[PDB]
């Protein structure tokens, strides 16, 4: 059913576009200045703030870039927004930029300080997908969350409490949690956790376990390709009428759109452009915890690890100066594309009867997992048969299987 | 026909309720003190005694529990009783508590001393359902009796005799007996027993056989969910008007009622509360000889075997002291519910004609059973298609089939 799903999400994309265009028309920015991922960001946040203000706005004068610090009627923003979405709220829309920000943050930064202070191992990076993503995020907003993400929450919710209506949250937060797991025990053990009203260190210690189980027996976590407002604004302005032509966040749509995007970015004096583009590209698909090998494969070019990456962050801090500042054109094109998945892969003498049921008449769930954990090899092939698609292959017709026998450059972005 | 059966039994339940309330109002007990299964018991027995006295009554003072030994006008009790039942006798009602006691005794105790002294094998536990149940019990009182229960009687009735009106008893006692069996031979062999006026060891030895046949080819024995007086008293007091809203002893009614009951119990210093609740719960449904697997399944939690059970009995003996005595809240809720059943499951050269009948004109019944006994496997599935119901599923609409592939904990409560 390509009617609702493909076209309803198109309508949410149109809104962001239209809005971005309106909002650019207010700031009286130029074309080059509306394609500046910097300005786009500022705008996106102005809005999410107002629906839950001012910001940094960079301008282009003969030669050099001028940063303007501006403020807008928090309500005016809310007004312009609905105007674009037909006076609707389109929470989806705000939630969308709510993720684009997430996916950018899960790639620009490593959130160790928080994991440890929670009592999670810093090496549990690949499980913190969407830790930055405000709780306000929607229902299809949490589906993008990593197993580890959920744990950091419950553990804090629990840690301060164990140190009214708050209950329905906890159970659900676990049901979601449990719905990440895709194996018997995994599933069952989550329940054994959800049993306690005042779950103390008993739970505190157990979920942490399950957190680590996902490092081997991963769960189902959706990935959403969420591009910057400017990209959708520009597209809408170019005529693309997505609600009519359909759009996806896990298909070929997002890659194709980025195959023509003209996004520019501010770049510090010593930073490497090629390195900058990489970053943004990984935020456009939630590839911050993907196997670098595959990311580079699909990308078309080296996908260098975070450490070797030359850049501190895409947003420009108030500290810096504009004199020594310039801007480059972001390389967001990719070689192939792939169905962003959700799956984590996997490899007396008689009895007197008292009830009417189908009945033959006559340990530690940890262990179960630990035993499963064991038989698992890192070489264990997942998504058997699934492949990569050419950018011409609009339909999911012909798949391509990658062979990694190659002089690679690592697998752990972090 | 949900009119008489469902509402007439409601009326008998109202009586017990109303009465319990009146009787609590006399003793001037508190709410917490009326919910004490202990006191409830005492009251129930005060009444059955008077209709065929005093008792132990526990009181709550700052901190500790005080046991009062009290006495009441045997007739006063009989007076208050009828007052509650509209001046009726409601034998059903007395018989009801007559069973609640039974079902509690068939689970708190193992009656081996008596079986052997009768000449029954001690391993015939699962057949002694209702051995404690006074003969005064009604007609729908004996239907709850196990096959083995009947045998212990006849054998004693016979044993002392073989060692006037007493005859009509014996034949009937067998007819009932026979009506337990649900197979040809079983049925027929009972008759071969009922033939002798002075049935000696001939019978003595044969019924014992049939007793053992039921271990394999079980009979039909009804199970009645009979809750303590307090539970009905409390319910009546809460507004539930059962005669109008209907009630059952083999439907969802009893489980639902126990889903809100606030029953408390006296508990000795070293005893395990969780273990205490289990006991009572098994007496509330005549699950003392049920397959532990299923009991736990429906229960929602482990249903531990009698040996591993930490408790000596719910009633407090005159021996004990109150100083070292405290009380817990009984866990009587269950996960699902099931239709308490009655069924035991199963898998010259010519002739000169002298009479006018449809006629083509031309060993040891033990063997028959022993042969049937044989083909029987413990794995033989019973109640094919019958399942368990959610506690929301008021109607018997959607059934649930349990799969016991699982790390269970036994099948024989004893």
From Swiss-Prot, chains A, B:
Any one GO MF annotation of this record: RNA binding
Pfam families listed in its UniProt record: Flu_NP
Keyword entries, A-Z: Capsid protein, Helical capsid protein, Host nucleus, Host-virus interaction, Ribonucleoprotein, RNA-binding, Viral nucleoprotein, Viral penetration into host nucleus, Virion, Virus entry into host cell
GO BP terms, alphabetized: negative stranded viral RNA replication; symbiont entry into host cell; viral penetration into host nucleus
Bilayer-spanning residue ranges: none
InterPro entries: Flu_NP
Sequence similarity: Belongs to the influenza viruses nucleoprotein family.
HAMAP family: INFV_NCAP
Binding partners and assembly: Homomultimerizes to form the nucleocapsid. May bind host exportin-1/XPO1. Binds to viral genomic RNA. Protein-RNA contacts are mediated by a combination of electrostatic interactions between positively charged residues and the phosphate backbone and planar interactions between aromatic side chains and bases.
Protein name per the record: Nucleoprotein
Species this protein is from: Influenza A virus (strain A/Wilson-Smith/1933 H1N1) (Influenza A virus (strain A/WS/1933 H1N1))
């Amino acid at each position: 059913n390509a009617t609702e799903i493909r076209a309803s999400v198109g309508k949410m994309i149109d809104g962001i576009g239209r809005f971005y265009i309106q909002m650019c028309t207010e700031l009286k920015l130029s074309d080059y200045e509306g394609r500046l991922i910097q300005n786009s960001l500022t705008i996106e946040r102005m809005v999410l703030s107002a629906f839950d203000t001012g910001g940094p706005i960079y301008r282009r004068v003969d030669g050099k870039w001028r940063r303007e610090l501006i403020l807008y009627d928090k309500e005016e923003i809310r007004r312009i927004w609905r105007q674009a979405n037909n006076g609707d709220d389109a929470t989806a829309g705000l939630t969308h930029m709510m993720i684009w920000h997430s996916n950018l943050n899960d790639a620009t930064y490593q959130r160790t300080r928080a994991l440890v202070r929670t009592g999670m191992d810093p090496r549990m990076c690949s499980l913190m997908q969407g830790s930055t993503l405000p709780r306000r995020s929607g229902a299809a907003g949490a589906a993008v969350k990593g197993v580890g993400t959920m744990v950091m929450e419950l553990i804090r919710m629990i840690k301060r409490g164990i140190n009214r209506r708050t209950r329905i949250a906890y159970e659900r937060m676990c049901n979601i949690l449990k719905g990440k797991f895709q194996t018997a025990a995994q599933r069952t053990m989550v329940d054994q956790v959800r049993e306690s009203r005042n779950p103390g260190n008993a739970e505190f210690e157990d979920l942490i376990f399950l957190a680590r189980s996902a490092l081997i027996l991963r769960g189902s976590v959706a990935h959403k390709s969420c591009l910057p407002a400017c990209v959708y604004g520009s597209a809408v302005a170019s005529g693309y009428d997505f609600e009519r032509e359909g759009y996806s966040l896990v298909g070929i749509d997002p890659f194709r759109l980025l195959q023509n995007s003209q996004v520019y970015s501010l770049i510090r004096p010593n930073e490497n452009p090629a390195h900058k583009s990489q970053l943004v590209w990984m935020a456009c698909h939630s590839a911050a915890f993907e196997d670098l090998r595959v990311s580079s494969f699909i990308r078309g070019t080296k996908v260098v690890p975070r450490g070797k990456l030359s850049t501190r962050g895409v947003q420009i801090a108030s500290n810096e100066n504009m004199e020594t500042m310039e801007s480059s054109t972001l390389e967001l094109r990719s070689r192939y594309w792939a169905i962003r998945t959700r799956s984590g892969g996997n490899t007396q003498i008689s009895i007197q009867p008292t009830f009417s049921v189908q009945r033959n008449l006559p340990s530690d769930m940890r262990t179960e997992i630990i035993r499963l954990m064991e038989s698992a090899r890192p070489e264990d092939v997942s998504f058997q048969g699934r492949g990569v698609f050419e950018l011409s292959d609009e339909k999911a017709t012909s798949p391509i299987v990658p062979s990694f026998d190659m002089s690679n450059e690592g697998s752990y972005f972090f």
